[PDB]
Amino acid sequence: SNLIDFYIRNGILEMENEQAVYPVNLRGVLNILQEMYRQYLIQSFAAKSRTEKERLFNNLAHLGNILGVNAIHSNIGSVIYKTYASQALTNNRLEEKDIEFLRNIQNMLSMDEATCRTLLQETKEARAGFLFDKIFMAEAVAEFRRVCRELDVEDRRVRAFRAEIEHAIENSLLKESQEELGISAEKARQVLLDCIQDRCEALIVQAAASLRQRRQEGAARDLSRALRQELYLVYQAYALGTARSNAENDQVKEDLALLREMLGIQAA
């Protein structure tokens, strides 16, 4: 039966490749017929010795003889034999290492230029992990824009800005615009109003929270005034007004006024 069939397999009757085969199966777990070809095939894609080169592909033949074109399937094969070991060199270790291992990979395979037809297909989405869930960080969400250009070269503007906001605030002005321009290197360059509606609803919390009880809203000012009750907080502007006047340096002179012109411009 499938019992005299496997007993026909008693024909192929390898121990090695046979065992290894079924072994590669029952284990990994399945068309008794299927893996049969499978394992064999990649076993052939191996190193030659004129007669093994023969028995193998020769029985590899008696195989198609079994199944008995569909042989495009021997392409769905290496396909993953690639994709796997492929994206294997995924997480940035591109090198001459990839270069190296890779080729040789497609070597013990068929694969015409199709290589690329995946080389990136992989490298491609290879990013779709990171820059997709760029949230779980922002320096990475940017790290995408870092390398997610290196290889591959919609609220995509949201993080773009958020990662631009958090990064910019923590973080010259116009060449850093080039850092926010790294964002225009992902999103449009006209979404400053999703930037402003994104950098405006931030200043507040500092106003609301710094402004609450004992000593200062001078801090929530220094950093929130790092942008570009009513007179009460205009006193933090008064507070540093003198507190800042901690040197009366040439600049201290100009940064104190316009700034105090901002809390003053952002009057109330």
Numbering used by the authors: 903 to 931, 934 to 972, 978 to 1045, 1051 to 1067, 1077 to 1094, 1103 to 1159, 1179 to 1218
What did the paper state?
Tic110 is an essential translocon component. Tic110 is therefore proposed to be the major channel for translocation of protein across the inner membrane. The second model also shows Tic110 with a membrane anchor composed of TM1 and TM2, but the rest of the protein is entirely soluble and localized in the stroma. Tic110 is thus proposed to function as a scaffold in the stroma for binding transit peptides emerging from the inner-membrane channel, and for recruiting/tethering other translocon components located in the stroma.
CmTic110C, composed of residues 871–1218, contains the corresponding region from the middle of TM5 to the C terminus. The crystal structure of CmTic110C was determined by selenium single-wavelength anomalous dispersion (Se-SAD) at a resolution of 4.2 Å. The structure comprises 14 α-helices of seven continuous anti-parallel helix-loop-helix pairs, forming an elongated shape of about 96 × 28 × 15 Å. Due to the low resolution, CmTic110C is assigned as a poly-Ala structure, except for the six Met residues. This region is 28.2 Å high, much smaller than the 60–80 Å thickness observed for the chloroplast inner envelope membrane. Therefore, this helix is unlikely to cross the inner membrane. In the crystal packing, CmTic110C formed an extended superstructure with tail-to-tail and head-to-head packing. Therefore, the shape and structure of the Tic110 C-terminal region most likely also enable Tic110 to function as a scaffold for interacting with other proteins in the chloroplast translocon complex.
